[PDB]
Amino acid sequence: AALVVDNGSGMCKAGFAGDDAPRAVFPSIVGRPRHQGVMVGMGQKDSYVGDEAQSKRGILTLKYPIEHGIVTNWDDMEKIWHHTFYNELRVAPEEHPVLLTEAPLSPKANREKMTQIMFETFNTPAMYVAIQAVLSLYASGRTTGIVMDSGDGVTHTVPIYEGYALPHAILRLDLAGRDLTDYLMKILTERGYSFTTTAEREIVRDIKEKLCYVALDFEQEMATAASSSSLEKSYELPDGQVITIGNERFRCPEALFQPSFLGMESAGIHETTFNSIMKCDVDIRKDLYANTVLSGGTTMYPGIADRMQKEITALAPSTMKIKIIAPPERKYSVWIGGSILASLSTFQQMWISKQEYDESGPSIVHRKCF
Amino acid sequence: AALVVDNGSGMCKAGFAGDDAPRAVFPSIVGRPRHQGVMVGMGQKDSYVGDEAQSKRGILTLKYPIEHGIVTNWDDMEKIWHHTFYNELRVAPEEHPVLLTEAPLSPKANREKMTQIMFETFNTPAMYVAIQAVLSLYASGRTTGIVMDSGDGVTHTVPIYEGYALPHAILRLDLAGRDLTDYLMKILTERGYSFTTTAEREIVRDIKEKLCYVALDFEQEMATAASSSSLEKSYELPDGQVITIGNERFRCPEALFQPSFLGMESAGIHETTFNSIMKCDVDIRKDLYANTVLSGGTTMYPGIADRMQKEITALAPSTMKIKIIAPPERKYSVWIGGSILASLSTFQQMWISKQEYDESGPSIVHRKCF
Amino acid sequence: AALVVDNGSGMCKAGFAGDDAPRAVFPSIVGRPRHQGVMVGMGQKDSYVGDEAQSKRGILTLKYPIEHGIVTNWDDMEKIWHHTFYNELRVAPEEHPVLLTEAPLSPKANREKMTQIMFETFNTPAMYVAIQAVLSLYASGRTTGIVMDSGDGVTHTVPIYEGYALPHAILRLDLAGRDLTDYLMKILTERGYSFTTTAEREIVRDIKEKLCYVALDFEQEMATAASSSSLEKSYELPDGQVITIGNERFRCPEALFQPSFLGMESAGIHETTFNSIMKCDVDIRKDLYANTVLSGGTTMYPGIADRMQKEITALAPSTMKIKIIAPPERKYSVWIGGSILASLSTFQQMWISKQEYDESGPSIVHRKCF
Amino acid sequence: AALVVDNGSGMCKAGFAGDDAPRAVFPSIVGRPRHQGVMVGMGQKDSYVGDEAQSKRGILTLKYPIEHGIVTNWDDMEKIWHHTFYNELRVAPEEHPVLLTEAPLSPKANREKMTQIMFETFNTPAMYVAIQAVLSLYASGRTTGIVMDSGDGVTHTVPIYEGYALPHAILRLDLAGRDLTDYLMKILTERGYSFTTTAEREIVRDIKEKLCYVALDFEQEMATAASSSSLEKSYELPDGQVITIGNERFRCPEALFQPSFLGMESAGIHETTFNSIMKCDVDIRKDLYANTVLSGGTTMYPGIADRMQKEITALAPSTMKIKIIAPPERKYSVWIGGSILASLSTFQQMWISKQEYDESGPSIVHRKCF
Amino acid sequence: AALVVDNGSGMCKAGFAGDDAPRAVFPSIVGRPRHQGVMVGMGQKDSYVGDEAQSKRGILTLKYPIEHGIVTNWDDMEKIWHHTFYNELRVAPEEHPVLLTEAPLSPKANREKMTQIMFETFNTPAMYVAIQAVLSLYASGRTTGIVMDSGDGVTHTVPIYEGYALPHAILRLDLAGRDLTDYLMKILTERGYSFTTTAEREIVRDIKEKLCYVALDFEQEMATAASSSSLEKSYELPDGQVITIGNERFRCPEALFQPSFLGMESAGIHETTFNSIMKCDVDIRKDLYANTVLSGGTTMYPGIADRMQKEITALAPSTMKIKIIAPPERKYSVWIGGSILASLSTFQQMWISKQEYDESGPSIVHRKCF
Ligand SMILES: Nc1ncnc2c1ncn2[C@@H]1O[C@H](COP(=O)(O)OP(=O)(O)O)[C@@H](O)[C@H]1O
Ligand SMILES: Nc1ncnc2c1ncn2[C@@H]1O[C@H](COP(=O)(O)OP(=O)(O)O)[C@@H](O)[C@H]1O
Ligand SMILES: Nc1ncnc2c1ncn2[C@@H]1O[C@H](COP(=O)(O)OP(=O)(O)O)[C@@H](O)[C@H]1O
Ligand SMILES: Nc1ncnc2c1ncn2[C@@H]1O[C@H](COP(=O)(O)OP(=O)(O)O)[C@@H](O)[C@H]1O
Numbered sequence A, B, C, D, E: 001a002a003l004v005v006d007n008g009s010g011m012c013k014a015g016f017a018g019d020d021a022p023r024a025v026f027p028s029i030v031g032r033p034r035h036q037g038v039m040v041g042m043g044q045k046d047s048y049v050g051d052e053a054q055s056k057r058g059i060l061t062l063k064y065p066i067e068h069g070i071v072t073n074w075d076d077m078e079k080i081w082h083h084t085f086y087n088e089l090r091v092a093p094e095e096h097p098v099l100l101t102e103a104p105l106s107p108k109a110n111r112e113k114m115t116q117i118m119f120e121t122f123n124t125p126a127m128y129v130a131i132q133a134v135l136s137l138y139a140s141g142r143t144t145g146i147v148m149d150s151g152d153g154v155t156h157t158v159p160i161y162e163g164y165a166l167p168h169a170i171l172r173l174d175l176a177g178r179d180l181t182d183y184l185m186k187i188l189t190e191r192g193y194s195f196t197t198t199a200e201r202e203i204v205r206d207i208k209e210k211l212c213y214v215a216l217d218f219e220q221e222m223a224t225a226a227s228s229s230s231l232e233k234s235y236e237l238p239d240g241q242v243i244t245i246g247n248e249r250f251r252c253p254e255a256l257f258q259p260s261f262l263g264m265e266s267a268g269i270h271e272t273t274f275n276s277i278m279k280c281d282v283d284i285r286k287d288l289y290a291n292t293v294l295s296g297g298t299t300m301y302p303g304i305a306d307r308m309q310k311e312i313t314a315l316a317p318s319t320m321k322i323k324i325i326a327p328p329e330r331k332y333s334v335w336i337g338g339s340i341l342a343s344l345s346t347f348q349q350m351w352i353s354k355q356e357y358d359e360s361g362p363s364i365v366h367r368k369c370f
């Protein structure tokens, strides 16, 4: 069987081709102790990865090796891949081909380093690197649609028509889940709550995933939150302290549609999707309007599909049928797509084997790369 | 039964001899993908022909193998004939004789290549190549008349008297439907509408076929369009956008009567018909005036028969009876004529069989050729 | 009943003996197609005769089998006789005796070929060949007179006295209707009108028969035409074009009296008649002067009898009574005479039967031949 | 000195009497701009004449004021005469008598308009209009011969004997160089070459003058061209494109001997010359056979004298000596003859002066007119 | 003196007629603050134009009022014209006539709005709107040539012959400098460089103008860049960071010759120029080949003239002399031409005065408009 590994900026999803869900989903973090050990006989490791770093985060500094979809620390990336293969999946990487994923418009050194590490450090027999938007389209059983994938690092709108990608129409919004976490940390100071460490950043991400939602009309929701108090929710911190948040619940996700809240000049995700559709030929825009596919963890806010539908309907001509496809499993769509791709009989010929890599080099790794 | 195939520059009309209408009418286009395919398992063919190329035109480059009645790409012409025989008519070309059509004054290599392809690629038992104007005269049940056939590539005026052709009086105007489509594309830029790709050219051809008409008096119509706004019509693009056109509606067909709008030096279709009549003997001009037969898709503009009548009446002596015959089925007249010709008992002896072609060669294909 | 057939260079007049007018009068022409037929199922014959050749003359080359009274094409002459017997009179030539006509001083091979064709091709029971001038004298009920017969091919003056012909006084002027048609074609170029084809020659003959007349005094008429414009007439061509002719109207017939207009050296018809009278014995000239009989289509110009009277009065002694007999039916006089001759009880013994022709041969055909 | 101006349908030849060659030979064309001028300060004239119209023909519509020897536009004819006098010869027309030329059997309004324009627009002191065939006979130093002059507009056969013209034997064939140019344009479409504009007509005329020739035996030459490829020649178009022509080289001039190629009913130039000789008296035919003089630019095809000799020898009795006189300067024979005529002391009394024209009018201009 | 204002999509060039260079050349941008001002007493304007917007671009959003040659914001266009007249030229627009420029095939509402604004907002006495290609031809001292003008918005090929425009042969390529800037931004992400804001777009345009060049052979240059490292150049960002670019230097301008790099279907600038030449009459193509004039800032890449020469030589017949005219001042050619045009004595009559505009309206503004 083949291994499917979706490495995002925030979470790593690993599993076996043919399955319907990732077997191992864990934070893509490396934690290192920031205090001196004083007790003899303690199994104090030098670093912690994933959930073990998340459970000991009180005495650790946590670092993401991937930032804005770009690997900034390849040693920590190798640590995370080692943890994936040996601790999470508990398999030998030299026995299975590995399907990895990457975002469009990424540096070529990224894919080249991934291939070099997979072939020289883990000694995988075969290997492939697929584009995440194409996999998200595989997961929904479509060959036409514009995929809006927003994870932890970056957001991308990729239009595909009848299996053909339109790379000139691909748009990138450098704003995703981690920026929303930082913005929530910033606006929680207005209520006197102070989160500053990396562990507190993990706490704020938990708050965001539990309590934040997308308002259908932002100004009406602001007026509602200012008038009464029915939007206030409570959250218990790990030390038993209880915080209460009101309009922040919908002010954090609103930065997805108004990036000026983050001091950014770019347009929201709705205008990004619309502009990506408008860069395509006039004859495919109608099919793209009816197949707008949401993907990633940042699209999991309650009410984001309705808000997206409303905004794109406001931007598009009135005769177009705007249809936002937001499946309940869209947090794993990429991985699911990868699974579907790695189980196709037609795909079993596109693996880059180790012999081809030894005889050609890093130039052969760019297969269906856009 | 015999197969009747009218191959024009724009449309292919195919059917069986004895029928009253073509069974398969489709655009004479070949579409090829201009983007890279990124999805595995998609039935991405190398090329598309006819309506399948028209439905996928968003990701295709469209090419006409025939330009100005001249085949510029014989491989694409064979693709179109294959699509005609196997996908549209769904017959075996080695079982039926084939009646093909050609315009007068065409290169002889055209007919020779057509015969070679029909006898060596499709292995047709018998084959004939008829002149399109004679077929258009068959369709109207006449033996005397001047046929003005204007399709997509070229316009021809062919006078025939009592079944005798006057080849010295045949006139050719290198201006037809595709030139009018290009001119409409050009003059739509005056309103800020930009159509540049081949798919947008198909869109503009649709606009032309739906909204354009021939003004009886051009300057009066221009004054009317400049004064009020009752001539303005709206058209919805495939992406839901709505464009509005005014005088363009009658400025595009006006190039048929004033080719100087296209930068051409030739005379209009009315003066071409009149000059073709005036090259004939004085004793047949009266019968030619009363039997001016319009044929082809470019004669399907509303008001072209009345304008033609008015112009030729202005050119001819006042005692002559100008009568423009414009049947409602004149878009298929050629094909209909071919049908009538291929069902005649007197014609069943004019088929060029494969034995005659093998024993003689390309010299035998010129039968009743003018 | 007997058949009377007057074969002239221009017209064939056929009918039954005893009638007062020819039943079938048609042009003595054979038309052959000069273009290629392109339509299947058309009744395109190989040749056309008479009025059917005249109606289709736009696509035909027209040929007269008789030129200057001499048959130049005996196959076309047989075609014309076949058309006469089967299409015009609609009789069986093997049931009726045939009275044919010939001009005086004609080659003997002409009469011999006529007899051979009538007896071997049409199998007529009896046959006779009469002289046209004697028949013209029969038509006027006279036995004395000088007949001036001018048809399409040749003009002849034949004096007859008390039923006796004076063959030594017979004069021939090789100038008749067809020469006048050619001269009218030539002088119409002075006004910019161009007639060149055989069909246009038929048009010019129609113009001549409708508009030309004989001026009583030629120089006075020329001065009148040069001064004012009251002599100008208009004529509508078959294609609706209108031409205007002035002095040509009387310049074309003037060549009958001044053959030098045609580059001919001979004398006019008046001097020819006078010289023919002066070759006769002095005792019969007075009776010849009073019985000058005009005959043929070329004597049908308005004012030719008055001009003839004036000229012959100027040539003859002042005591002679010049009387020009010009009956209104003199275009058919020959035929009428033939009718009268074929209904005489005294003539029913002069028929050359087929038995006499088989037992004697071509030598018996010269009966009353001069 | 006197001015000699030969105005043909195609070329104007102007010079001074006494010279041996025309000083100014230029195309008889008027060119008018068919596009709008967009640059300020350009010397954009309203019309161009002659070689200046030929050099700017890319942006001009070219018109011949003379068509088939008939002036269809007298304003353009005056433009051409003005260009002749002031730009080409650079003389004052009010100081020299002018000898003009005309074809036989031309409308009288032509000569009258020429005289009116020469006396009222250019104020010439004296003026004469000579027949072109008589001048061509002057150029060869003969008083007996049949001149076959074929230029751009019309062909004429004029027999002259001992200085006497036989106007009744003059024949006109409405087929010359321009018809051959149009026929070459038509038959070049069989090889896919398309020439349609007036500038392209000038290009085709250049092709005809460079590459066309008369085949001695037409069917043998057709067989030779069909078998091998030694008759193929190449020609470089003004834009650098190279066309190749084969049998067309001798199929275009063959229309001079087989006018049915042009859909014409008339006989070839050989049969026209023979028929013109046969209309003359029997005593001068022997001298006419030995003095057949070719004249004009259309007689400049290589091999036309030999073909003419062969055809007329086939038509004439075997005891006659057929001699075709084709001098190498026969393109200018008319002009040369005019020069010789305008330098004769006996001719200095035949000038029509302006006083005679004022006292008599247009009636005096017909001097030796036939 | 007259004012000459060349308003392009990217730069505005303003000056006085008679000068040899524009006095004021500044970016055609309007910048608006995207942050809130917090300091009292700061001269914080509402908007910035030109160089003042370029110097403060760190806190501004920059907008081009012209996009693809089409004015999308007329208020910002008026702001730019006001900045031109009062801040750059420092003149009163009500004292000088203004010569403006426009691209061919532009919407008529563009010229009408320009005239309305110049006559009602700035109250100019006279005004004219010239075509930019004609001005570029004025600047080179020619009346014949095909101008290929590529600026920031659109590329146009306009052939002119002897001062006559051939509007039917004008071609438009919707691809110019701004598309190349966007493509450079896109391909700089392959090296990990991220430029997303409008200020960063200005930075990338600076990089393009400093480091990009046209490779003579693209594949050989790609092989050279892949092998060694001699093509790598460095560029210092405004914050002191240094980026290094290699093949991008010639991959960005290569989109001018291979628009498929941008996902466009159109042909390159070389094929566009060749097709524009081939739409002209055959007689002017030779002069157009020798006078191909480059114009605009997008033609300022090193090596574009040699590449253009090579490509057009490959497309044209081998006997043609391809000559690319690329003067060193071709970035201002249009303006220079305008200067030359506004100083001509012949032009001082083509100004549209305010009285004519008040008495006629927007219909009079179309003078020499094509
Ligand atoms: N229910 C939820 N609501 C809002 N955001 C969520 C939810 N679940 C996950 N996220 C956010 O999704 C982001 C990463 O999700 P994922 O699609 O795995 O991204 P990546 O592929 O970059 O790892 C995180 O920033 C996380 O905060
Ligand atoms: N209703 C219509 N009005 C105007 N033009 C039409 C109409 N229908 C078809 N056409 C034009 O007719 C042209 C081709 O018609 P057709 O006679 O099939 O030509 P061909 O024989 O060359 O294929 C096309 O350019 C199309 O735009
Ligand atoms: N009304 C008329 N006026 C002048 N000529 C006429 C008239 N009718 C007939 N003709 C001429 O008479 C000629 C032939 O008449 P016809 O006596 O039948 O001759 P033929 O006996 O040779 O056939 C024709 O050339 C025709 O032009
Ligand atoms: N060398 C040549 N071969 C064939 N045709 C020629 C040649 N030179 C000239 N011509 C033809 O001669 C014609 C006109 O010649 P010219 O005698 O000047 O006629 P015109 O007197 O009517 O001007 C033109 O149509 C031209 O094509």
Ligand SMILES: Nc1ncnc2c1ncn2[C@@H]1O[C@H](COP(=O)(O)OP(=O)(O)O)[C@@H](O)[C@H]1O
Pocket: E007, E008, E009, E010, E011, E012, E150, E151, E152, E153, E154, E176, E177, E178, E205, E208, E209, E210, E295, E296, E297, E298, E299, E300, E301, E331
């Ligand atoms: N040296 C250079 N090399 C390449 N491109 C240049 C250079 N200088 C200017 N440009 C480009 O030219 C474009 C605009 O130039 P210009 O001719 O002024 O256009 P416009 O007339 O539309 O303002 C800009 O996109 C700019 O990037």
Ligand SMILES: [Mg+2]
Pocket: A007, A008, A009, A132, A150, A151, A152, A296, A334
């Ligand atoms: Mg992801």
Ligand SMILES: [Mg+2]
Pocket: B007, B008, B009, B132, B150, B151, B152, B296, B334
């Ligand atoms: Mg057709």
Ligand SMILES: [Mg+2]
Pocket: C007, C008, C009, C132, C150, C151, C152, C296, C334
């Ligand atoms: Mg008779």
Ligand SMILES: [Mg+2]
Pocket: D007, D008, D009, D132, D150, D151, D152, D296, D334
């Ligand atoms: Mg001549």
Ligand SMILES: [Mg+2]
Pocket: E007, E008, E009, E132, E150, E151, E152, E296, E334
């Ligand atoms: Mg510009």
